[PDB]
Amino acid sequence: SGAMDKIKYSPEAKHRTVEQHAELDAKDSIANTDELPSNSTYNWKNGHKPDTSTSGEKDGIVEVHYPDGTVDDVNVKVTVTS
Ligand code: NA
């Protein structure tokens, strides 16, 4: 037996504040990518990319894809200013 990557690692959300119409790289919403394997990849969950076209408080979900194929879902928040 062994611990799969999504059990070993503990990604934590970073709250970002961005301007209306800003781009959002999913990795930028994870606070501790230095505590996760550097070959992990980050993407927005389908249907859960924060929409920066309007200002307000938005929610999103980051998928953290680990090298062993397991995946962590991370709830994040994005403040959009106008
Ligand atoms: Na985890």
Author numbering: 226 to 307
Sentences copied from the publication:
Proteins attached to the surface of group A and group B streptococcal human pathogens that contain tandemly arrayed Rib domains have been associated with invasive infections and proposed as potential vaccine candidates. Here, we study Rib domains from Rib, R28, and from a surface protein from Lactobacillus acidophilus. Together, these 5 structures of homologous Rib domains, and further sequence analyses, show Rib is an example of domain atrophy, a rare event in domain structural evolution involving the loss of core secondary structure elements, and also reveal the remarkable structural malleability of this domain family. The structure, molecular dynamics simulations, and small angle X-ray scattering of a Rib domain pair suggest tandemly arrayed domains are likely to form an elongated rod on the bacterial cell surface, thus suggesting a possible mechanism of immune evasion mediated through domain number variation.
Structures of single Rib domains with ∼38% sequence identity were solved: RibR (S. agalactiae Rib; amino acids 230 to 308) and R28N (S. pyogenes R28; amino acids 230 to 307). A 1.8-Å resolution structure of R28N was solved using the structure of RibR as a search model; the Cα root-mean-square deviation (rmsd) between RibR and R28N is 1.0 Å. RibS belongs to the “Rib” subfamily, giving a Cα rmsd value of 0.6 Å for superposition with both RibR and RibR28N, versus a Cα rmsd of 2.3 Å for RibL. As predicted, the Ig-fold D/E strands missing from RibR and R28N are also missing from RibS but are present in the RibL structure. Antibodies against, or intranasal immunization with, Rib conferred protection in animal models of GBS infection while antibodies to R28 conferred protection in an animal model of S. pyogenes infection. Cross-protective immunity has been observed on immunization with Rib and R28 against strains expressing the noncognate antigen.
